[PDB]
Enzyme design. Structure first.
Site, PDB file in Angstrom:
ATOM      1  N   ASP A  97     -36.135 -26.117  59.770  1.00  9.91           N
ATOM      2  CA  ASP A  97     -36.349 -27.566  59.752  1.00  9.91           C
ATOM      3  C   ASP A  97     -37.807 -28.025  59.825  1.00  9.91           C
ATOM      4  OD1 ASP A  97     -36.011 -30.341  60.056  1.00  9.91           O
ATOM      5  OD2 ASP A  97     -34.213 -30.065  61.288  1.00  9.91           O
ATOM      6  N   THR A  98     -38.398 -28.377  58.685  1.00 11.29           N
ATOM      7  CA  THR A  98     -39.789 -28.835  58.670  1.00 11.29           C
ATOM      8  C   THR A  98     -39.948 -30.194  59.355  1.00 11.29           C
ATOM      9  OG1 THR A  98     -39.482 -29.821  56.469  1.00 11.29           O
ATOM     10  CG2 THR A  98     -40.396 -27.578  56.574  1.00 11.29           C
ATOM     11  N   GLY A  99     -38.841 -30.911  59.500  1.00 13.18           N
ATOM     12  CA  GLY A  99     -38.886 -32.211  60.145  1.00 13.18           C
ATOM     13  C   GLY A  99     -38.844 -32.126  61.660  1.00 13.18           C
TER      14      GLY A  99
HETATM   15  C1  5AH Z   1     -40.705 -35.561  66.892  1.00 14.59           C
HETATM   16  O1  5AH Z   1     -39.289 -35.343  67.071  1.00 14.59           O
HETATM   17  C2  5AH Z   1     -38.758 -34.310  66.374  1.00 14.59           C
HETATM   18  O2  5AH Z   1     -39.389 -33.571  65.622  1.00 14.59           O
HETATM   19  N1  5AH Z   1     -37.438 -34.194  66.611  1.00 14.59           N
HETATM   20  C3  5AH Z   1     -36.647 -33.148  65.970  1.00 14.59           C
HETATM   21  C4  5AH Z   1     -35.787 -33.940  64.971  1.00 14.59           C
HETATM   22  O3  5AH Z   1     -34.810 -34.559  65.376  1.00 14.59           O
HETATM   23  N2  5AH Z   1     -36.117 -33.966  63.645  1.00 14.59           N
HETATM   24  N3  5AH Z   1     -35.272 -34.766  62.652  1.00 14.59           N
HETATM   25  C5  5AH Z   1     -34.420 -33.861  61.842  1.00 14.59           C
HETATM   26  C6  5AH Z   1     -33.261 -33.261  62.697  1.00 14.59           C
HETATM   27  C7  5AH Z   1     -32.000 -32.811  61.885  1.00 14.59           C
HETATM   28  O4  5AH Z   1     -32.447 -32.092  60.708  1.00 14.59           O
HETATM   29  C8  5AH Z   1     -31.106 -31.831  62.753  1.00 14.59           C
HETATM   30  C9  5AH Z   1     -29.669 -31.550  62.215  1.00 14.59           C
HETATM   31  C10 5AH Z   1     -29.478 -30.733  61.058  1.00 14.59           C
HETATM   32  C11 5AH Z   1     -28.171 -30.479  60.559  1.00 14.59           C
HETATM   33  C12 5AH Z   1     -27.034 -31.037  61.208  1.00 14.59           C
HETATM   34  C13 5AH Z   1     -27.211 -31.853  62.364  1.00 14.59           C
HETATM   35  C14 5AH Z   1     -28.518 -32.107  62.866  1.00 14.59           C
HETATM   36  C15 5AH Z   1     -31.111 -33.999  61.468  1.00 14.59           C
HETATM   37  O5  5AH Z   1     -30.969 -34.957  62.211  1.00 14.59           O
HETATM   38  N4  5AH Z   1     -30.479 -33.922  60.264  1.00 14.59           N
HETATM   39  C16 5AH Z   1     -29.580 -34.987  59.792  1.00 14.59           C
HETATM   40  C17 5AH Z   1     -30.249 -36.054  58.935  1.00 14.59           C
HETATM   41  C18 5AH Z   1     -31.543 -36.637  59.098  1.00 14.59           C
HETATM   42  C19 5AH Z   1     -31.964 -37.624  58.175  1.00 14.59           C
HETATM   43  C20 5AH Z   1     -31.109 -38.030  57.104  1.00 14.59           C
HETATM   44  C21 5AH Z   1     -29.819 -37.448  56.944  1.00 14.59           C
HETATM   45  C22 5AH Z   1     -29.406 -36.458  57.874  1.00 14.59           C
HETATM   46  C23 5AH Z   1     -28.081 -35.704  57.902  1.00 14.59           C
HETATM   47  C24 5AH Z   1     -28.379 -34.541  58.884  1.00 14.59           C
HETATM   48  O6  5AH Z   1     -28.648 -33.346  58.104  1.00 14.59           O
HETATM   49  C25 5AH Z   1     -36.137 -35.776  61.999  1.00 14.59           C
HETATM   50  C26 5AH Z   1     -36.644 -36.743  63.073  1.00 14.59           C
HETATM   51  C27 5AH Z   1     -38.019 -36.765  63.451  1.00 14.59           C
HETATM   52  C28 5AH Z   1     -38.473 -37.666  64.459  1.00 14.59           C
HETATM   53  C29 5AH Z   1     -37.557 -38.550  65.110  1.00 14.59           C
HETATM   54  C30 5AH Z   1     -38.040 -39.497  66.176  1.00 14.59           C
HETATM   55  C31 5AH Z   1     -37.329 -39.727  67.391  1.00 14.59           C
HETATM   56  C32 5AH Z   1     -37.853 -40.642  68.339  1.00 14.59           C
HETATM   57  C33 5AH Z   1     -39.077 -41.322  68.081  1.00 14.59           C
HETATM   58  C34 5AH Z   1     -39.750 -41.094  66.913  1.00 14.59           C
HETATM   59  N5  5AH Z   1     -39.262 -40.212  65.975  1.00 14.59           N
HETATM   60  C35 5AH Z   1     -36.180 -38.515  64.718  1.00 14.59           C
HETATM   61  C36 5AH Z   1     -35.732 -37.622  63.712  1.00 14.59           C
HETATM   62  C37 5AH Z   1     -35.864 -32.259  67.034  1.00 14.59           C
HETATM   63  C38 5AH Z   1     -34.855 -31.310  66.310  1.00 14.59           C
HETATM   64  C39 5AH Z   1     -35.079 -33.092  68.100  1.00 14.59           C
HETATM   65  C40 5AH Z   1     -36.902 -31.386  67.812  1.00 14.59           C
END
Ligand code: 5AH
Lengths: 99, 99
Positions: free
Chosen positions: A25-27
């Site tokens: 996960d690059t995000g």
């Molecule tokens: C800086 O915070 C992070 O990097 N958080 C990570 C994270 O959530 N990354 N996520 C991506 C996470 C994920 O990829 C995880 C996942 C994958 C597969 C199944 C279930 C969960 C996700 O949720 N994916 C879903 C998804 C996402 C967007 C669109 C569609 C979909 C469908 C899903 O595939 C991006 C993110 C970044 C910042 C904030 C944020 C929060 C607070 C304040 C500011 N910014 C909120 C979301 C984590 C993991 C909790 C360490």
């Protein structure tokens, strides 16, 4: 290797001598895995995602293999919907995005 | 280009005649942006991530441009804490993970 994104970038990881499936996960800033046991003491951490925040246990300097590539870093453990490998470890294995 | 992961992979996107910053997220199935207006029909959808689910509006066949690369696909709009470009669009611009 080169991984396309037509499907989820799921890979096999090894931690604590056990094999598990995780998502590259690059995000994700950090790496969070489903409930499991890890050695040593842990610190508290709050991580936020799409639906809000969750409390997790932070373990540092944990050996972890990702697709055969050895890494040693911070692993979070908590009620995550799925195992995710974040940038903290992706950088250790030399992963980059390309297009 | 080659994007390293030392920092969050943020890029500029063009959509709905607007310019916004979004995160290249290989861990995201879909693309979801913060509240904005988009033309055409839509339907509700529940998407889940770390923290639970949020309700978003699903718009299909939406033209988008990422780092100069044009593509078209489904774009979700809702209370996401940050703009995310998921795999449904990453594939179209030929983005891959490499290590
Ligand atoms: C800086 O915070 C992070 O990097 N958080 C990570 C994270 O959530 N990354 N996520 C991506 C996470 C994920 O990829 C995880 C996942 C994958 C597969 C199944 C279930 C969960 C996700 O949720 N994916 C879903 C998804 C996402 C967007 C669109 C569609 C979909 C469908 C899903 O595939 C991006 C993110 C970044 C910042 C904030 C944020 C929060 C607070 C304040 C500011 N910014 C909120 C979301 C984590 C993991 C909790 C360490």
């Amino acid at each position: 290797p080169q991984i396309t994104l037509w499907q989820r970038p799921l890979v096999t990881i090894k931690i604590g001598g056990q094999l598990k499936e995780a998502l590259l996960d690059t995000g994700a800033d950090d790496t969070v895995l489903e409930e499991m046991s890890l050695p040593g003491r842990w610190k508290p951490k709050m991580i936020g995602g799409i639906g809000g925040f969750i409390k997790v246990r932070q373990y540092d300097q944990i050996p972890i293999e990702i697709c055969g590539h050895k890494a040693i870093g911070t692993v979070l453990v908590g009620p995550t919907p799925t195992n995710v490998i974040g940038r903290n470890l992706l950088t250790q294995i030399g992963c980059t995005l390309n297009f």
